[PDB]
Curated annotation (Swiss-Prot):
One Pfam family this sequence matches: Pep_deformylase
SUPFAM superfamilies: Peptide deformylase
Name by which UniProt lists this protein: Peptide deformylase 1
Active site residues according to the UniProt entry: 133
Amino acid sequence: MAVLEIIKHPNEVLETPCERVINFDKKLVKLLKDMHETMLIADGVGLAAPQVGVSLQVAVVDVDDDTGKIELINPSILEKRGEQVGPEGCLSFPGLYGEVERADYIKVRAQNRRGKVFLLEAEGFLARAIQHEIDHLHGVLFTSKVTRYYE
Ligand SMILES: CCCCC[C@H](CC(=O)NO)C(=O)N[C@H](C(=O)N1CCC[C@H]1CO)C(C)C
Ligand code: NI
């Protein structure tokens, strides 16, 4: 493993929508493994590939032990229901926090390391984290959805 450098907002790679993953290869596996530990070391509950300088639709979330890490490749949100309002920060904007409204329930379709397609349903905080990461894969930063920044 390697502790990847997390890209901060002073950077164009953060707004570049990502390309889909095509070759589910060893290098993709190493990317995910390095991302998960790098994320955890930095106290994040999620991380997207553009945050480590890679413009591929790859992300990982790990908000609870039971659930555990959930790697997402080429994810798309098939459905959303209800809404939730709450505080969000981002590893690419250290120190910045704002109020953000997201869907409460989400149904997601994504691929694992071997390219197999699975279906995941989430809600509350895990659904928020997932939406935040999926935004990153499309070049969208939370800053564009902040209702107000906190004092
Ligand atoms: C909540 C939405 C998902 C956030 C994902 C980010 C990591 C990230 O930037 N991913 O792209 C994170 O872990 N953010 C943390 C965060 O926002 N937290 C941690 C506790 C709850 C919330 C408080 O704002 C801190 C590290 C800034
Ligand atoms: Ni972020």
